[PDB]
């Protein structure tokens, strides 16, 4: 392929259930990044399809998702 910018935005999705599991960055140099703060191996379901995106600058901020805790109120 012809590459047009610094990374591709991908979604990992369950195509069966429809569920979006996460988003991630596939850098053009061939490795994928997630934003995650834990310490802490975090494991994902392997069934499990990736979809492009976007291009995406290299400073694109991914959604960390993950803390599945919104811990606070409001009203």
């Amino acid at each position: 392929f012809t590459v047009q910018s610094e990374a591709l935005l991908l979604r990992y999705r369950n195509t069966l259930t429809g569920q979006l599991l996460f988003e991630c960055k596939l850098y053009n140099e061939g490795y994928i990044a997630l934003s995650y703060s834990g310490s802490g191996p975090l494991t994902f379901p392997t069934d499990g399809i990736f979809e492009v995106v976007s291009w995406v600058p290299r400073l694109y901020q991914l959604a960390s998702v993950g803390s599945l805790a919104t811990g606070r109120m409001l009203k």
Binding site: F1, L8, T46, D47, I49, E51
Partner: protein
């Protein structure tokens, strides 16, 4: 812009720039049982993007029509310009025609909720309209890489 008419759109790929007005015709013709009105307002280039409320739309030169109207409403899309003409870039801001629902749509009679009004928009250039410079038709590549749908 030329992208409002299929023929023009095709010719667009061959020229660099344009100037002129368009003639727009929106078509409606719901059942005698439907009631409702829409509003079309012309927004000057330079205003920017803002979420307009129905009441705001009134502030712009507008036209209101009942969804049942047989004959298509004709609205001239004037080419308000700050400069002499246009080029085919993103630096251009042209006039807009925003059409929103003015009053809720409600069918009377034996209401078949499958009933929605199907509108159509047709256009043709005003004889003022002209394309400008002849240019190498094309230049719309889009090589987008994909991934195979194989689970890990």
């Amino acid at each position: 812009g030329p992208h409002l008419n299929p023929f023009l759109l095709h010719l667009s790929q061959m020229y660099n720039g344009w100037v002129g007005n368009m003639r727009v015709r929106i078509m409606l013709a719901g059942n005698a049982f439907t009631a409702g009105k829409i509003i079309v307002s012309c927004i000057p280039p330079g205003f920017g993007s803002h979420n307009l409320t129905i009441a705001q739309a009134t502030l712009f030169p507008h036209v209101i029509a009942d969804v049942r109207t047989l004959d298509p409403i004709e609205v001239p899309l004037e080419d308000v310009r700050n400069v002499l003409f246009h080029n085919n870039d993103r630096n251009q801001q042209t006039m807009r025609l925003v059409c929103m629902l003015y009053t809720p749509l409600r069918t009377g009679g034996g209401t078949g909720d499958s009933f929605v009004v199907a509108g159509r928009v047709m256009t043709c250039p005003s004889p003022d309209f002209n394309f400008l410079f002849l240019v190498p038709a094309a230049a719309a590549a889009a090589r987008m890489v994909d991934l195979p749908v194989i689970q890990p």
